[PDB]
Scaffold this active site. Structure first.
Site, PDB file in Angstrom:
ATOM      1  N   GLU A  11      27.750  34.990  34.802  1.00 57.27           N
ATOM      2  CA  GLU A  11      27.698  36.329  34.565  1.00 57.27           C
ATOM      3  C   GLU A  11      26.280  37.006  34.209  1.00 57.27           C
ATOM      4  OE1 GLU A  11      31.596  36.692  34.071  1.00 57.27           O
ATOM      5  OE2 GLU A  11      30.074  38.149  34.052  1.00 57.27           O
ATOM      6  N   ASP A  20      29.566  46.487  36.086  1.00 59.19           N
ATOM      7  CA  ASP A  20      30.060  44.992  36.441  1.00 59.19           C
ATOM      8  C   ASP A  20      30.360  45.242  37.760  1.00 59.19           C
ATOM      9  OD1 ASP A  20      33.283  44.417  35.210  1.00 59.19           O
ATOM     10  OD2 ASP A  20      32.576  45.844  36.413  1.00 59.19           O
TER      11      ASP A  20
END
Length: 164
Positions: A11, A20
């Protein structure tokens, strides 16, 4: 290597609101803020999460706090889910980390839809499961990450992350 270092590699860490891979507002270590298109809605969810006026920016400690929460919540969700629990319980410690990684990324609901792959993992048919897992939108959209997770389920080792 552990679930925390693994997710930290997958991440990244960002201290300012960002979008994202799916284009949703996120911050820290993959902490989804909202699927709403409004940056305002996102800053609002942010402040609610941290308990202060953040102005879209958080500190490292705050990011890690969210991160600790999210991991705990992912585990607790798996334990409460009737589809997931039995799989998780059947797995070794490394492979458990792989399932937690999917749940963290795509939510209970997202994973709970990998029915056939889940059955295979439960049965310990590693190679077959690796192949079935790859027949997913997840793999097509985030191939590098999906490959790492998949390798992890296939080998039961942290080899795909020892690289990184």
């Amino acid at each position: 290597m552990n679930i925390f270092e693994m997710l930290r590699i997958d991440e990244g860490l960002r201290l300012k609101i960002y979008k994202d891979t799916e284009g949703y507002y996120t911050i820290g270590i993959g902490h989804l803020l909202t699927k709403s298109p409004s940056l305002n809605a996102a800053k609002s969810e942010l402040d609610k999460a941290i308990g202060r006026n953040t102005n879209g920016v958080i500190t490292k400690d705050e990011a890690e706090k969210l991160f600790n929460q999210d991991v705990d919540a992912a585990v607790r969700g798996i334990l409460r889910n009737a589809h997931l629990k039995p799989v998780y319980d059947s797995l070794d410690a490394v492979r458990r980390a792989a399932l937690i990684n999917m749940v963290f990324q795509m939510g209970e609901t997202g994973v709970d839809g990998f029915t056939n792959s889940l059955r295979m993992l439960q049965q310990k048919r590693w190679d077959e499961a690796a192949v079935n897992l790859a027949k997913s939108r997840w793999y097509n959209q985030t191939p590098n990450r999906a490959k790492r997770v998949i390798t992890t389920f296939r080998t039961g080792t942290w080899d795909a992350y020892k690289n990184l």
